[PDB]
Design an enzyme around this catalytic site. Structure first.
Site, PDB file in Angstrom:
ATOM      1  N   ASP A  31      -0.275  -4.681   2.856  1.00 23.63           N
ATOM      2  CA  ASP A  31       0.955  -4.020   2.441  1.00 23.63           C
ATOM      3  C   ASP A  31       1.391  -3.189   3.644  1.00 23.63           C
ATOM      4  O   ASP A  31       0.948  -2.056   3.825  1.00 23.63           O
ATOM      5  CB  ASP A  31       0.667  -3.180   1.209  1.00 23.63           C
ATOM      6  CG  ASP A  31       1.941  -2.489   0.626  1.00 23.63           C
ATOM      7  OD1 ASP A  31       2.925  -2.164   1.371  1.00 23.63           O
ATOM      8  OD2 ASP A  31       1.843  -2.139  -0.575  1.00 23.63           O
ATOM      9  N   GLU A 123      -5.541   7.860   0.443  1.00 24.26           N
ATOM     10  CA  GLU A 123      -4.520   7.154  -0.281  1.00 24.26           C
ATOM     11  C   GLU A 123      -4.852   7.183  -1.784  1.00 24.26           C
ATOM     12  O   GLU A 123      -5.357   6.200  -2.345  1.00 24.26           O
ATOM     13  CB  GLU A 123      -4.325   5.730   0.208  1.00 24.26           C
ATOM     14  CG  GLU A 123      -3.064   5.178  -0.471  1.00 24.26           C
ATOM     15  CD  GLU A 123      -2.999   3.672  -0.494  1.00 24.26           C
ATOM     16  OE1 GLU A 123      -2.318   3.154   0.408  1.00 24.26           O
ATOM     17  OE2 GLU A 123      -3.565   3.003  -1.415  1.00 24.26           O
ATOM     18  N   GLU A 132      -4.900   5.954 -12.186  1.00 22.39           N
ATOM     19  CA  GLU A 132      -6.246   5.932 -11.579  1.00 22.39           C
ATOM     20  C   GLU A 132      -6.912   7.298 -11.480  1.00 22.39           C
ATOM     21  O   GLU A 132      -8.131   7.368 -11.312  1.00 22.39           O
ATOM     22  CB  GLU A 132      -6.317   5.188 -10.211  1.00 22.39           C
ATOM     23  CG  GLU A 132      -5.788   3.767 -10.254  1.00 22.39           C
ATOM     24  CD  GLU A 132      -5.793   3.115  -8.854  1.00 22.39           C
ATOM     25  OE1 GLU A 132      -4.734   2.581  -8.479  1.00 22.39           O
ATOM     26  OE2 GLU A 132      -6.814   3.218  -8.088  1.00 22.39           O
ATOM     27  N   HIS A 280       3.092  -2.741  -2.924  1.00 24.78           N
ATOM     28  CA  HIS A 280       2.295  -3.198  -4.049  1.00 24.78           C
ATOM     29  C   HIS A 280       2.301  -2.199  -5.252  1.00 24.78           C
ATOM     30  O   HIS A 280       1.760  -2.511  -6.312  1.00 24.78           O
ATOM     31  CB  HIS A 280       0.843  -3.505  -3.608  1.00 24.78           C
ATOM     32  CG  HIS A 280       0.653  -4.852  -2.964  1.00 24.78           C
ATOM     33  ND1 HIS A 280       1.049  -5.166  -1.682  1.00 24.78           N
ATOM     34  CD2 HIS A 280       0.062  -5.974  -3.445  1.00 24.78           C
ATOM     35  CE1 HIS A 280       0.712  -6.406  -1.394  1.00 24.78           C
ATOM     36  NE2 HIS A 280       0.130  -6.929  -2.457  1.00 24.78           N
TER      37      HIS A 280
END
Ligand code: KY5
Ligand code: KY5
Lengths: 342, 342
Positions: A31, A123, A132, A280
């Site tokens: 990406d 990240e 998440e 993404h």
């Protein structure tokens, strides 16, 4: 640990198994918007890394730690809880960087670092920024940050905006109406139609769209990672008041996010907006089970409430009303079960 | 229980979560080959159900139990371990069958039935037949079967055949060669290329293909569900000797399965063969690390060994050789992590 207390073991096992695959690391590395923007943020702000001590939270392949090394960091502690830690160590050795990058296997909530750090890199963004719950690990890691240390990324902006998309709405409705049939091979399924509609409309839709579907300018909600505490992300209340620019049916709210790397030389943005090249992360749409009619000039007000759950995700509550008519919609979504429509 | 002793709790949690969604039940119900074949097997064998006691192992929505009711069963015990049991109960009530279908929430290894049954029905088949290990729950349920009771399905046939697919083989190296770059944003990735190749080859490939890629008639391995014990599925050894029909490079073995419902009136087959209309099982292909050259008339011999694991799947070991030349190959594959290529 803080991690295991907030996470069901079965979610954790699947999560770290997934990131343990080289194919998954490859997908993210490819990406280019992501990888290229991180590299630019780090290298253009080389003074924030030169001769500094760095923590890389959730290093994966180690790519961000390599960028910190290219910018001149003296020492980088690269923490990773999946088996990807072993592959990162292979790369550190094959790139002759054993004097600068130190892989530390384990959860950032559980490991021991030998010293405090000048800057944290990671990240930690998921779908809709928060999915998440890795932002909590990122904020947790500030226990290692020297006073006046920096965070890359520094801030995150969530954007929300009302949209119209009759075709998307009809797709989800068409699938739920399977459960209307009074004689599916002779069997009446129709007592489950309500449950089916609820289940389908609880799924956030991950894909992109043309910006012409947006019916008002976005509302922005900002999290400052230098100031936020991990506990601030357990319950996230986002009020909104939209000034409608177009008349029509509002089928839901669209979400995207931007993060900024606020360095000493310059500020570099990574945006997942629908006006920007695709990532993404795509964008995320939360449908309303019944759309709301609004006229241009009306106000659409309400609250988006995100409540963290132990499956490393959020239960999303959206309540919205058209102030001029009192038309109201209340919706509950399960960010752990998205519909990947792209 | 027998179930929890053979299954990691984290695998079980994810497995029953997945089957708890109405959308997943709908996807299976809409696979016409499946639903239509089960209904035909049951209705055309109405004497195996009329006034009988039935057990439905893993009833999901309850669809097979409704078919048993349409065929005239006196009493049907419908066991289901996911939250889908609640939805099945709603359907039993709305279809006015509370006097005939009894939904029993829980695992078939753990619940209590009040009486022995004349016939067991289930859809326990996964990819390659055995994936998910639900066949063991099906066989376990024979503790409830009267002597000379029947099983629907009665037998299952796994088919294997050698294939050639140069493009599929080459795709593994094309993907892995991402890592064979000395300066991916300044980083030498090359030391991980071997690990990437290994990872991709460990994944069985789930998709369909043209029958022209098959190089020999399939070898069949049959499990007779009336006779088999649970324990027979822990280690499944499938010897093969293929008489090659076409000359070329053998890149691996392709797998599919058929089941037969052997009723008193007729035998009805459900096939997932590549010569038949497609199902959501597709077919499965396991690559060899190195392709093997064979001529038409040669014999390709070896063993496929499936060893059950606690993630409700199998470790697959394939060894093969061309008898006429001594050229040999193997692979080890992880059926729990298939590559969905379709
Ligand atoms: N949004 C998806 C992020 C995917 N990765 C980032 C890998 C860096 N790679 C990049 C970055 C930019 C471009 C290309 N590649 C996260 C990894 O963080 C790991 N993890 C999560 N939580 C913890 C924790 N509590 N303790 C230690 N480790 C943790 C996880 O296992 C990932 O491996
Ligand atoms: N691909 C195979 C999966 C399909 N089946 C449900 C299908 C009902 N049949 C049909 C037939 C045609 C079309 C649609 N549906 C799985 C369900 O079995 C349940 N389960 C699994 N293991 C156990 C166990 N140990 N104890 C109790 N329950 C168990 C599972 O939770 C599924 O709900």
């Amino acid at each position: 640990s803080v991690f295991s207390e907030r996470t069901e073991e079965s979610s954790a096992v699947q999560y770290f198994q997934f990131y343990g695959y080289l194919s998954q690391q490859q997908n993210m590395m490819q990406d280019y918007v992501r990888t290229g923007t991180y590299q630019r943020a780090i290298l253009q702000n080389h003074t924030d890394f030169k001769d500094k001590i760095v923590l890389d939270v959730g290093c994966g392949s180690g790519i961000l730690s390599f960028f910190a090394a290219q910018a001149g960091a003296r020492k980088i502690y690269a923490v990773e809880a999946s088996t990807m830690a072993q592959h990162a160590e292979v790369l550190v050795k094959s790139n002759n960087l054993t004097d600068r990058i130190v892989v530390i296997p384990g959860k950032v909530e559980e490991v021991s670092l030998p010293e405090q750090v000048d800057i944290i890199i990671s990240e930690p963004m998921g779908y809709m920024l928060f999915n998440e719950r890795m932002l909590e690990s990122y904020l947790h890691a500030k226990k290692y940050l020297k006073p006046s240390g920096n965070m890359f990324p520094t801030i995150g902006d969530v954007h929300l905006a009302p949209f119209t998309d009759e075709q998307l709405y009809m797709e989800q409705f068409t699938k739920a109406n399977f459960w209307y049939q009074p004689s599916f091979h002779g069997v009446d399924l129709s007592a489950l139609r309500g449950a089916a509609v609820d289940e389908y409309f609880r799924q956030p839709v991950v894909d992109t769209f043309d910006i012409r579907i947006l019916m008002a300018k976005s509302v922005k909600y900002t999290v400052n990672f230098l100031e936020a505490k991990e506990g601030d992300l357990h319950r996230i209340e986002i009020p909104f008041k939209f000034h409608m620019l177009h008349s029509g049916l509002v089928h839901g709210l669209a979400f995207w996010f931007d993060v900024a790397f606020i360095g000493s030389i310059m500020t570099v943005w990574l945006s997942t907006a629908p006006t920007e090249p695709l990532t993404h992360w795509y964008q995320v749409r939360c449908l309303f089970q019944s759309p709301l009619f609004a006229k241009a000039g009306d106000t659409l007000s309400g609250t988006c409430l995100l409540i963290a759950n132990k499956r490393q995700s959020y239960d999303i509550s959206i309540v919205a009303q058209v102030d001029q008519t009192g038309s109201k919609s209340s919706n509950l979504l399960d960010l752990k079960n998205p519909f990947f429509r792209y």
